[PDB]
Every structure is written in C-alpha cells, then in structure tokens.
C-alpha cells in the first residue's frame, strides 16, 4: 500500500494521442512563457507595500521573483525532488523503478510532496520575515497566494511537458535568468545605462559596468565546456559505391557531452537555497541551529559557510569561506550525481547493442562491422560522464562562476546556457526530417 487515495485526487494534465504540430507545440510553449513573466510582474495582495530587501540567493535557482505571485517559483518542486532523490537514492527506500509501478510511484509521490512543499515553503518564507508584516490574518492570505502561484507552475510544467517544447522547470529558470540580465543591463534600472550615464556624468564608474562584464566572462567560460571532438563510425552502409558518387558509410558522431548530470547540480544549488531559507526561518522564529543571521542574510553558522559569494564582484576577504563553500558544493554535486545513479540515470551497456541488427543497407550490404556485443564498453566509456563524472566538475565550474560573480547568477547563467542549448535546437528540430528523414547513419 501507499498514499494512493489522495494521490488519485491530485489532478493531472490530460495528454492527447492526436497530432500536436511543431507549430502548436511552440505556440503552447509560448503561451506558458508569457503567463510565467506575467506572474513575475504582479505583486501579491499585501497592504504592507514594505518588504525587507530580498533573498538574493534564492531567486536565481528557484526561478522566482520575490514579492510577486511567483515569490516561491519552482523552489518547492525542486525541494520535493531533492527529498525523493535523497531517500530512494540512499537506499533508505530501495525502489527499483523498472516496473511502471515504482516509476509512477517515484513520480506521483514526488508530485504529492511537491504540493506539500508548496505550502511548507510558502509558510517558511513569511516566517523568515520576507514581507515584514506578520499580522496573522494578512499573513494567512499572503501564504495562500504565494503557494498557489507555485501550484500553477506545477501545472504549467505539466502543460509544457505534454503540449510543448522542452521542460517547464528548465524553461522557467532560463526565462528568469535571461530576463534578470536583459532588464538588469538595459531596463529602467539598467546597469549599461547607469554606466553610460556615469561616463557622460564625467565620473566613469567601473562598478556599474562591472556586473555586466562578469556576465560576459561567465557566458564565454560556460559555453567552452562541451566543445571537443570525439566521433565514432563503425556503423556501416555502402550504397552507390564510388567515392565521388556520394559517400559509403553511416556516419554517427558526438562533439558535445555531459547531458544528464545537469539535474544533479540544479539539486545541489537548490539544497543550499533551502538551508539559507530554512535557517533564517528557524532563526527569527526559534533557535539558531543552522546559523545566525542579522542584516538579512547569514553572518554565521553552517548557513554562512554554505552561502554563495556572488552579486557584482569577487569576495577575496574570506578565503576559508570560499574554500569550505567550494568543497561543500562539489561534494553536494557528487552526492546528487550518485543518487542520479541509484534513482534515475542513463544506460550504456545495451545502448551499445541497440544499433546492430543491421547497419544501413542499399538494400544489399549486410553489416557486421558493428558487432552486436563487443560494443558495450564503447558505450561504457562514453556514458558516463553523463550521470556523474562531471557532476564534480560542473559543481566546481558553477562555484567559480560565482566567485567571479555575474548578473542573473554565475551558476544561473551556467544552467540557463545549457537549458537554452538543449532548447534552442528543439525550436529548430522538427523541420528537416518531416520530408521523411535524412538518413543512412545506422
């Protein structure tokens, strides 16, 4: 038995078997995209227009804008996904998700908990004094609104996940970071214009262009991190032989790598988002257990040594802080990467053997250049690093991306660039092989 009765009573999106055209999928993604940004621009009903600063850390990973309808963003959905990866991944629950039973029960449970986290995080946020009026009536009203907008985002994820292009959760983070940059540089508080105005003002301010430069360095750095050429042809064809006739082979290659170890470092950063949140919440409504705060953010404790330095420039004042945080993030990334081994990962051994039944035939040439086994290894050299083995590396890269600092978050840029790249090609993807495919690569 499980939590079945109320699990049934969670709504779920009604997926069609009917055609969704590429045009329709793109358009469906775009309506959701606009609904997201809309909720980022409407502030919650609170009579208190006063809000005590921001949590600078939280917004990037969470894909949230504090004080809006989506104050709470994709935060809870991630927080719940943390906890399932924790429990099924440690083998505290040993679930083998091979059966559609435990696959669906991994997922449906996590959704149910997603919803639990939606209010738990909503209550935790106001408890952490993120609106500065703790009038219990108005506080109750605000908690409703903050969590419900995250619930909308659970459902909007499902829509994009079934009616559109890319994933909801991916898209919302990339959306939020992209917008933070464009506005933060060029908007009505734009750093490019604060800078340019400073030039004209006759006192050039290295500071106002400084978080702009931060972003460019990080963007360049992030993007040269899967550029590489490996390539294998063992897939065979020969059709119409003669070497200026056309060609004669089946012509597979990669050039780009690391591709299921992403969701791990999303989790790793998010875990710290919870601790900085949870600790501050526990601080001004109970006992310091995870640290001491004041001035908004952490100043001490477990919560300080785990805080992110970024915002406009490097922090070189505290080198031990940098060392502990860095070590902490790496090992946290190793941890969710290994739980991306023990619960939800990627295959090589039989991904190996998947291709050889045939290569490509004229019809006429009947392969055995590919050998159906004697290929497992080729795969088991290739994959990972794709669930682990650059989880470490990415967590490193993300951390130092924050020590440089950037606008929209150095790590948020890092995730965004990647989400965008798996996305971009999806926008493009449909068009060529609906002439029936371009072919001859098996």
């Amino acid at each position: 038995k499980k939590l079945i009765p109320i699990l049934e009573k969670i709504p779920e999106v009604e997926l069609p078997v009917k055609e969704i055209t590429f045009k329709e999928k793109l358009k469906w993604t775009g309506i959701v995209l606009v609904l997201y940004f809309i909720m980022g621009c409407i502030d919650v009903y609170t009579a208190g227009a006063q809000i005590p600063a921001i949590f600078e850390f939280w917004q990037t990973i969470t894909a949230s804008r504090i004080g809006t309808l989506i104050t709470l963003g994709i935060g809870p959905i991630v927080t719940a996904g943390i906890i399932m990866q924790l429990l099924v991944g440690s083998g505290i629950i040993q679930m083998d998700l091979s059966i559609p039973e435990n696959r669906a029960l991994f997922q449906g449970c996590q959704k149910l908990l997603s919803i639990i986290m939606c209010f738990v995080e909503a209550v935790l946020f106001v408890g952490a004094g993120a609106f500065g009026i703790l009038t219990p009536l108005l506080a109750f009203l605000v908690i409703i609104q903050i969590a419900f907008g995250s619930i909308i985002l659970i459902y909007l994820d499902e829509i994009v996940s079934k009616y559109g292009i890319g994933s909801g959760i991916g898209l919302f983070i990339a959306a939020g970071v992209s917008q933070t940059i464009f506005v933060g540089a060029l908007g009505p508080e734009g750093y490019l214009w604060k800078f340019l105005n400073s030039l004209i003002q006759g006192v050039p301010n290295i500071e106002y262009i400084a978080p702009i430069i931060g972003t460019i360095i990080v963007f360049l750095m992030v993007v040269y991190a899967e550029c590489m050429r490996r390539r294998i042809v063992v897939n065979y064809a020969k059709r119409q032989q003669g070497r200026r006739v056309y060609a004669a082979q089946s012509t597979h290659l990669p050039l780009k790598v690391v591709y299921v170890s992403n969701i791990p470092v999303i989790l790793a950063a998010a875990l710290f988002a919870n601790i900085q949140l949870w600790g501050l919440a526990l601080y001004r409504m109970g006992i310091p257990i995870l640290g001491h705060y004041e001035g908004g953010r952490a100043v001490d404790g477990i919560a300080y040594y785990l805080s992110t330095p970024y915002g406009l420039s490097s922090v070189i004042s505290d080198p031990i802080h940098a060392i502990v945080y860095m070590i902490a993030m790496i090992i946290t990334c190793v941890m969710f990467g290994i739980f991306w081994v023990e619960t939800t990962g990627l295959d090589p051994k039989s991904m190996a053997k998947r291709i050889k039944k045939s290569g490509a035939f004229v019809p006429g040439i009947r392969p055995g250049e590919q050998t159906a086994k004697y290929i497992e290894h080729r795969l088991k050299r290739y994959i990972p690093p794709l669930t682990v083995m650059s989880s470490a590396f990415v967590g490193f890269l993300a951390t130092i991306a924050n020590f440089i600092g950037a606008l929209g978050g150095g790590t948020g840029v890092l995730l965004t660039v990647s989400i965008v790249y798996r996305m971009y090609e999806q926008l493009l993807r449909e068009k060529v092989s609906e002439l029936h495919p371009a072919i001859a690569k098996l």
């Binding site: 063992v234 032989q241 055995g368 250049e369 590919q370 050998t371 004697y374």
Partner: protein, 93 residues
C-alpha cells in the same frame, strides 16, 4: 647519412572496428598500417621519439584474406601491414 626522415613518414592508419581494437590499437600493443616492409627500426624508433617505447616486441605481418573494394565486382587487394607491435609503454597520448 645516419638515419632518414623517410621512415619517419611511416604513418598510414591505425586499424579499427569490431574485435581486435581493444588493446590492439590502444594501450601496449598497437596495430596499424606501417609502410610496406616496415623497417623494424624506424618503426620502433619513431615511437621512441614519441612515447619513448623501445617497443616490447616489434613485429610485422602483411595482411591477408581475399580481395574486395568492389567484392561483387572484381576486387583488388593492395596489401599492407598490421604492425602488430607490442609497445613497451603507451601512456603519452
């Protein structure tokens, strides 16, 4: 006049594909089209200027078994080498 760059121009291809690529094209032991008589000399000393291998066993064998290259037309086999040396190192790649 003491050696020749002429057999430092010996590279023509590493073998590949299915079985026998495993440590036969990688690690110690490597197999590759090497000249046509090799030389057993500047084919062990042109990797001794590259991996420092004094080569665990320098071998040769010209490579055989049927014409193809249009095997359903008439085929032609020009013939070539598998070096089939064992290198004494393989670690500076």
């Amino acid at each position: 006049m003491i050696r020749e760059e002429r057999l430092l121009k010996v590279l023509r291809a590493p073998h590949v594909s299915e079985k026998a690529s495993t440590a036969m094209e990688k690690s110690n032991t490597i197999v590759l089209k090497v000249a046509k008589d090799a030389t057993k000399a500047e084919i062990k000393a042109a990797v001794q200027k590259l991996f420092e291998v004094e080569v665990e066993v320098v071998n040769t064998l010209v490579v055989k078994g049927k014409v193809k290259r249009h095997g359903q037309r008439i085929g032609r086999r020009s013939d070539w080498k598998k070096a089939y040396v064992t290198l004494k190192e393989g670690q500076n790649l």
